Design a protein around this ligand. Sequence first.
Ligand SMILES: CC(=O)N[C@@H]1[C@@H](O)[C@H](O[C@@H]2O[C@H](CO)[C@@H](O)[C@H](O)[C@H]2NC(C)=O)[C@@H](CO)O[C@H]1O
Length: 326
Amino acid sequence: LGSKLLVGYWHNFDNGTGIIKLKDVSPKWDVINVSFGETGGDRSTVEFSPVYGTDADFKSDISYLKSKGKKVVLSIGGQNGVVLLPDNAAKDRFINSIQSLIDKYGFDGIDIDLQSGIYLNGNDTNFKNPTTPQIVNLISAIRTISDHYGPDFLLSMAPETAYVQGGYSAYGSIWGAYLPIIYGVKDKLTYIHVQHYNAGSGIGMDGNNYNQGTADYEVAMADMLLHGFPVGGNANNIFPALRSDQVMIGLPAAPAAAPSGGYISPTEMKKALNYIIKGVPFGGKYKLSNQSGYPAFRGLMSWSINWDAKNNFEFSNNYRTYFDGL
Ligand SMILES: CC(=O)N[C@@H]1[C@@H](O)[C@H](O[C@@H]2O[C@H](CO)[C@@H](O)[C@H](O)[C@H]2NC(C)=O)[C@@H](CO)O[C@H]1O
């Protein structure tokens, strides 16, 4: 896996942007997050069927990409996905159904993109030791699935900001709810790409409010994970820094990819990237915690490959050239 990645979500569906067959995906993407595994009635058995091709065709397309150095990852969740693991039985259905799918298609890893059904219960106050079954069991399942595969099974996650940086303001309900998951699987975690979009405003470690889609916002939000931060207003409850190589930023490929805002122009985003990676500022209001940068910052994720293809390949072309240019 390269040191500066472009991770692109791939639509296993036509939402009007069309279907791109796997071999027609731009090689600028290093990792392809196939979207999405979802559940039926039991909310625990994950299901997936390719939007084009026989199962064997799709598996073959995945093998081809892998032969080219690309990673093809199964994403679980997104917008409409629901996974509920109230008990061990549900956890086991989740584990087994996901392993079967990885075995069936040869996926390189999994991406956790669960955006519903995840809450810190009352009394669940310690991110190092969660008590909410959904959280405890998700952690357990993720470790178990990761441990079912070889030395470079890829694990990623794409939580919304409330679940992560939100933990700076509160710890309970959705606020900070992915912190225990991140912490619980950090030794297996390849990288996390929080969704810096459909997000409104975020509070930086300088206590200031930042608006999504601005360079300052992107730096302030990433710095939380790069530096670590106190949780829920408690100076004595510090969430530790992840490895810089575990930190990515998730962005919309085009304005329309995130209908509630979040899109940032590459020209503005490169300002943020230069500051995060090299400690080179751009006259912004946010001050980076390490003013000489975090060189090992892992790269950018985008929703999505399909949106990118529809937007003059702006995201993939701009950021591949930027990262290659470093
Ligand atoms: C990772 C990620 O961006 N997850 C969310 C996306 O799922 C979501 O895109 C929407 O996904 C739906 C399936 O879950 C599609 O039906 C829907 O068409 C698609 N919407 C668009 C505009 O592409 C994005 C939307 O910005 O939000 C993410 O949170």
